[PDB]
């Protein structure tokens, strides 16, 4: 179906520890494929998926140039925003930026986005029509005026509907064996007595991709949200993800509960029982 | 490829 490409930038000023740290990561769907860390030795954009290494040297030189210019842009903006908020340079502050584009099943542009934060709160965001900005506070309206004068929205839209979509399509094709393949969860259940009269049933889902998944407990065929515990989906480290859901049940009645697993890689939902 | 527009804030 749909696919996305997304970049995440983080710039942190660090009084006493040198110039601001700048970290950039690129994702296609749930798969990281490039990174830049201003603290690393290479000073280069670096590959993080096999299929991005299909790109020639001009790609790596130009991306490295481009991402290091962005780090300088964040360095300037950190100083500019300090002045807007009247903050001293002896403090640490953080700019975060996320942007990207989605394509549909036909490979055609679906939507684009760009959101920026300062110190963990909304600063400025491109609106869904990609024609204007929503700034969140007074300082961000100063930014918004500058960006309107510089036609920043039209420039961002031109990337989002052009280069962004074109390179996403190329990445999806070069990475087809893994990016367009769905890995179904391997499931099992664990049982942990917590007292002489109660036990914990945990439903596991392991090795799945993409990261979207649904774990729901039932008792006697009826949905169970009471005394349940759902954990945040987590990376296994090899490109797949893991998740579990648990329920506390009366001891002796464990077999009256079922776990239900839904995933894009499953022809039909899975039902597990202890 | 990266493509955040870099007009100064």
């Amino acid at each position, epitope marked *: 179906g749909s696919h996305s490409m997304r970049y995440f930038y983080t710039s942190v000023s660090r009084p006493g520890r040198g110039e601001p740290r700048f970290i950039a990561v690129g994702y296609v769907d749930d798969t990281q494929f490039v990174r830049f860390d201003s603290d690393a030795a290479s000073q280069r954009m670096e590959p993080r998926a096999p299929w991005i290494e299909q790109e020639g040297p001009e790609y790596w030189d130009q991306e490295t140039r481009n991402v290091k210019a962005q780090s300088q842009t964040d360095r300037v903006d950190l100083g500019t925003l300090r002045g807007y908020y009247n903050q001293s340079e002896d403090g640490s502050h953080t700019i975060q930026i996320m942007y990207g584009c989605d394509v549909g099943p036909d490979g055609r542009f679906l939507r684009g986005y760009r959101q920026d934060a300062y110190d963990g709160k909304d600063y400025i965001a491109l609106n869904e029509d990609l024609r204007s900005w929503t700034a969140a506070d007074m300082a961000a309206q100063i930014t918004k005026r500058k960006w309107e004068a510089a036609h920043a929205a039209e*420039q961002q839209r031109a990337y989002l509907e052009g280069r962004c979509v074109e390179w996403l399509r190329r990445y999806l094709e070069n990475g087809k064996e893994t990016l367009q393949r769905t890995d179904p969860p391997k499931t099992h259940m664990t049982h942990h007595p917590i007292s002489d009269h109660e036990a914990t049933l945990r439903c596991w889902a392991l090795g799945f991709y993409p990261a979207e998944i649904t774990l729901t407990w039932q008792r006697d065929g009826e949905d169970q949200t009471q005394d349940t515990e759902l954990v945040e989906t987590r990376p296994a480290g090899d490109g797949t993800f893991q998740k579990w859901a648990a329920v506390v049940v009366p001891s002796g009645e464990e077999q009256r509960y079922t776990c239900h697993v839904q995933h894009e890689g499953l022809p039909k939902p899975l039902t597990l029982r202890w | 490829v990266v493509g955040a527009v870099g007009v100064g804030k």
Partner: T-cell receptor
Amino acid sequence: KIIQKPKYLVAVTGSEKILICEQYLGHNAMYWYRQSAKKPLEFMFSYSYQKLMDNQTASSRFQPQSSKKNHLDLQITALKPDDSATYFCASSQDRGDSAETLYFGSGTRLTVLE
Amino acid sequence: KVQQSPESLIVPEGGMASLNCTSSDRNVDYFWWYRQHSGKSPKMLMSIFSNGEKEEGRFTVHLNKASLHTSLHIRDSQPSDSALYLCAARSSGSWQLIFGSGTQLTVMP
């Protein structure tokens, strides 16, 4: 307020000259273009944050100097009469891939004589 | 490469000056029109960053991006409009303006 020195410049074949370009506008990108009869505004060099971003000059004799803030001087070595042209320095407030407009300095008219 | 037409144009005072500019580089996204008077430096006249048109005084710029085509319209032309008109383009992700060969406009008093 881009500053280009000098406005006119005679040089002898085989000599070396510096074309000065300074701006104190707080601009983060500076550029060099070349004006001749056949190419009114031929792109040469693009810098953002004192870093070379792009270059379309086919001679190593042209070396910009970007280590000094506010400057992008152009050094030309082993000058040839073919180098005679008007050299325009430009700047923009924002970096080169995002600039809304480029402002041009007055130009240095370079004439290389035997 | 940036292709401008016509190479030179003579219009009477009060007439319409029509100038065209196309790019052969399919990656171009933005266009500028610069005007350079003789002995002076190029000055930015109009800029256009998406499909459509923009009117400023006697000047209208149009952009048809699917054809990589921009046109500049100067109504009620003045002798002081006599100048070299330079078209410039830039692609998203490129770091400079690339200029065409220009149109020399003469407005006869």
